[PDB]
């Protein structure tokens, strides 16, 4: 509340200049120069201010040769509709084709929404940094009963994630990564230097290390960092790439023995710091490209990403996102899906397919508002198995686009209400066919190589429940090159997905369900329309009628139960059950769809079930004929036809 | 902040040539491109043209099409018009605004201070 | 050649009064008008840009609303800071075009 001169010697020359706080004060509404004057203790004398510097752990491995930025964000497509954030008016956007973007300046705005202190007065941080409070985001997880806990807390222009442990006692070892452009990174408070805290530092970009020499050490027991390697990711990675690769860590580690109990090694913390990057990255670009617009095709890419993020983080750990969603964009998203027809959607292309799955998870996250959605997400199921040949691992191209369909559907089933079952049960049924011997062959080669197959199968969403450990293990990669033991891990982190209890992304949705006495002896339900059929070794399974295949006496039973109309019997049929009727007269070549609606099951009567296959179309059935399918001469294998009609078919010769 | 900075002001004589400079700091230039705006004595403000993201495409405004040129170097940070066959009716005070942000659709923040083009033999 | 049309040319209101500022295109400009303040001898500064948003560090009671044709551009409050010149923009279709403007002299 004055105004104040400031005088010094610039190497003989009497310089001084005045600074004014009435103006100042008053003109920049954050500044208070009178807390800024008590944070710096201007009358510490030389002794503790050098006592303060030295306990500080300083960079000795500090450099890092440049790297470039991707260009992340595109250029405005010509003409597009550069919309606001906060006012989404209506039919603003017409159609998918149409080109739209929303302007980042108050996007900026509906992220970083929160407001928060960004650099605590905590002890380690205090002594180092002049105690800012910014518009901010965080993501945040506290495990080990809140006695290890990480806080990834980010701005438009730089990131700090702080990390702390309790060592059963009073004590807390604190360590905080600060990553973003060299020029934006908040002001040092002491005698401090920030190269001596910069760990890594190309063109625009800094990452710095901020903790005590007492703390530093104690992280040193379980948490090195490769910090070179971390940075080249943060830095050179685009922000939607870079969400995923952080999504193929936490999936690639949730299946398997990691994060049920974690464990406080240097990957999963190195990890921590890399899920804080991939919000950031998000909010960053949209921050840093000034007072523009943000392509709508980008945003849905990199908010799909951020969307399924934020899923498994939460389920890995005890965690919250809180500042990187703008419901501003999803009601953008939203709007956009009363644009395009849902059931007509596969047939658009792969670009078109992507962009609009994105919008739909998007739109309305907490899936379950406007159920349609789902019949979206099927049709470019359907869509893409019949052009895809049948029971063949799905290339990385369909693959993708159906993982992106798969999380609209996978929210549902989390939900206790049904929202429209009809579009749900043929999305399990085309997933169902679609789980394959190589299916299952590629994926656990995948797992066995950490490979893009890892990650995700149509199968995980599947009516199969015959799948345990012994059964994966027949169906692997034969190949001694590989290791066996990862093949073994691969076996184990696949039926770590698809548990059927403990996991509630399998099963209690179906109309059919409730006409099962023992569910764990269910081996797969095969829902066409106008009947469901129940395939387990359970006997007393409550449907229309029984058959019983001719098993072996190897395994335990092979029961088909069909439902008529997804309306139980009031208890199982008792008596012999239903022989299989064998069926000779029958034509290879159909110029009709006589098997339309069917189910195709394929089983070896030692192992089990080996493939199903649902006729859907006329490309199906012939598909089916016209190929190598049909091999009686193995008599170990049959072929049961499951009909509308309710019947139960063995298929032994054509002509 | 973000400041735009126009120094080429000066007297020309009719139809001559005037060679105009816009220093823009504060900012990431050349992800940005660039517009030019007159306001003549008494009268309204008037786009003339746009500099375009790359540069290589210049589009201007009728009256003053075929004559402006404008080059931009990015290592510079300096945008230079170049004005030719100057008349009477293009004197005014000339701003530069940054338009396009990752670049093709355009708009003007604050400009810059502007800089005095007098025709006037 | 699209045409901008704003009315009035002037206009007179005393302090805290409500002015509503209009500008009219002659096509449509769909949702890509703008809106800025140029008081004479300094620099124009940018107001409302979406024909809706307004822009940071600009006081609140400048709104901007309108799609298509018809755009607006209203101060809720006038302050004596306000007394300026403001011109609409429209940026659709290039060459861009200001309105003639309107000069808000301050009332007697």
């Known amino acids: 509340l004055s105004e104040v001169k400031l005088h010094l010697d610039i190497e003989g020359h009497a310089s001084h200049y005045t600074i004014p706080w009435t103006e100042l004060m008053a003109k920049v509404p954050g500044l208070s120069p009178e807390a800024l004057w008590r944070e710096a203790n201007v009358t510490e004398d030389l002794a503790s201010m050098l006592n303060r510097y030295k306990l500080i752990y300083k960079t000795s491995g500090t450099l890092g040769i440049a790297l470039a930025e991707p260009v992340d964000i595109p250029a405005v497509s010509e003409g597009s509709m550069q919309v606001d954030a906060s006012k989404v008016h209506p039919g603003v956007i017409s159609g998918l084709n149409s080109p739209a973007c929303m302007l980042s300046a108050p996007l900026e705005k509906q992220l970083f929404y929160y407001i928060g202190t960004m650099l605590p007065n905590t002890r380690p941080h205090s002594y180092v940094f002049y105690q800012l409070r910014c518009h901010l985001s965080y993501v945040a997880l506290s495990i080990n009963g809140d006695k290890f806990q990480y806080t990834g807390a980010m701005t438009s222009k730089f990131l700090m994630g702080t990390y702390k442990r309790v060592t059963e006692k009073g004590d807390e070892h604190v360590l905080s990564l600060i990553f973003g452009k060299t020029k934006d990174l908040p002001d040092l408070r002491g005698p401090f230097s920030y190269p001596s805290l910069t760990s890594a530092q190309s063109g625009d970009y800094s990452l710095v290390i901020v903790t005590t020499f007492v703390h530093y050490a104690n992280f040193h027991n379980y948490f090195v960092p490769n910090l070179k390697d971390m940075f080249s990711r943060a830095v050179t990675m685009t922000a939607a790439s870079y969400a995923r690769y952080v999504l193929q860590k936490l999936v690639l580690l949730e299946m398997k023995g990691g994060c049920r109990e974690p464990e406080l090694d240097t990957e999963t913390l190195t990890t921590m710091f890399e899920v804080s990057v991939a919000f950031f990255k998000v909010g960053h670009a949209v921050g840093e490209t000034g007072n523009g617009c943000v392509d709508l095709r980008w945003l849905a890419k990199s908010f799909f990403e951020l969307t399924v993020l934020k899923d498994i983080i939460g389920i890995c750990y005890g965690a919250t996102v809180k500042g990187m969603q703008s419901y501003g964009l999803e009601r953008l998203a939203a709007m956009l899906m009363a644009t395009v027809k849902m059931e007509e959607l596969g047939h658009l292309t792969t670009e078109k397919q992507e962009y609009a799955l994105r919008l739909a998870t998007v739109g309305y996250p907490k899936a379950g508002v406007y159920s349609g959605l789902i019949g979206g997400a099927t049709s470019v199921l359907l869509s893409a198995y019949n052009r895809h040949p049948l029971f063949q691992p799905l290339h990385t191209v369909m693959r993708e686009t159906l993982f992106i369909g798969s999380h609209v559907v996978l929210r549902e089933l989390r939900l206790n209400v049904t929202t429209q079952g009809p579009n749900l049960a043929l999305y399990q049924l085309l997933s169902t066919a679609l789980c394959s011997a190589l299916e299952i062959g590629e994926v656990l080669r995948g797992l066995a190589l950490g490979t893009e197959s890892g990650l995700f199968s149509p199968c995980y969403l599947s009516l199969r429940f015959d799948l345990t450990r012994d059964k994966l293990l027949s169906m692997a990669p034969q190949e001694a090159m590989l290791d066996q033991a990862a093949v073994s891990n691969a076996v184990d982190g696949f039926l770590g997905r698809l548990s059927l209890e403990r996991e509630d992304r399998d099963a209690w949705h179906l109309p059919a369900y409730k006409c099962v006495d023992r569910l764990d002896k269910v081996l797969m339900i095969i829902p066409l329309i106008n009947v469901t059929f129940i395939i387990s070794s359970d006997r007393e399974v409550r449907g229309s009628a029984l058959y019983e295949a001719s098993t072996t006496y190897l395994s335990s039973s092979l029961f088909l139960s069909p439902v008529i109309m997804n309306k139980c019997s009031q208890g199982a049929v008792a008596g012999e059950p239903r022989q299989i009727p064998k069926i000779q007269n029958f034509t290879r070549t159909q110029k009709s769809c006589i098997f339309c609606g069917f189910a195709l099951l394929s089983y070896d009567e030692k192992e089990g079930l080996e493939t199903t296959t649902y006729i859907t179309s006329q490309e199906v059935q012939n598909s089916i004929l016209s190929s190598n399918y049909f091999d009686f001469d193995n008599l170990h294998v049959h072929y049961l036809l499951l009909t509308t009609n309710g019947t139960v078919m063995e298929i032994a010769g054509l002509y | 902040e973000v400041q735009l900075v126009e120094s080429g002001g000066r007297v020309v004589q009719p139809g001559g040539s005037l060679r105009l400079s816009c220093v823009t700091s504060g900012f990431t230039f050349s992800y940005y491109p660039i517009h030019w705006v007159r306001q003549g004595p008494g009268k309204g403000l008037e786009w003339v043209t746009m500099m375009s993201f790359d540069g290589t495409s210049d589009h201007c405004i009728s009256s003053v099409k075929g004559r402006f040129v404008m080059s931009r170097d990015n290592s510079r940070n300096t945008l230079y018009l170049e004005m030719n066959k100057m008349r009477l009716e293009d004197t005014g005070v000339y701003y530069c605004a940054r338009g396009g942000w990752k670049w093709p659709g355009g708009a003007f923040d604050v400009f810059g201070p502007g800089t005095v083009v007098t025709v006037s033999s | 050649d699209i045409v901008m049309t704003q009315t009035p040319p002037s206009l007179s209101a005393s302090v805290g009064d409500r002015v509503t500022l209009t500008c009219r295109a002659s096509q449509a400009i769909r949702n890509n008008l703008a809106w800025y303040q140029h008081k004479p001898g300094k620099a124009p500064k940018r107001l409302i840009y979406?024909?809706?948003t307004l822009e940071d560090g600009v006081p609140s009671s400048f709104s901007g609303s309108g799609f298509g044709t018809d755009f607006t551009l209203t101060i809720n409050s006038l302050q004596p800071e306000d007394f300026a010149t403001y011109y609409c923009l429209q940026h659709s279709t290039y060459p861009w075009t200001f309105g003639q403007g309107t000069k808000v002299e301050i009332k007697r």
């Open positions: 979406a024909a809706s």
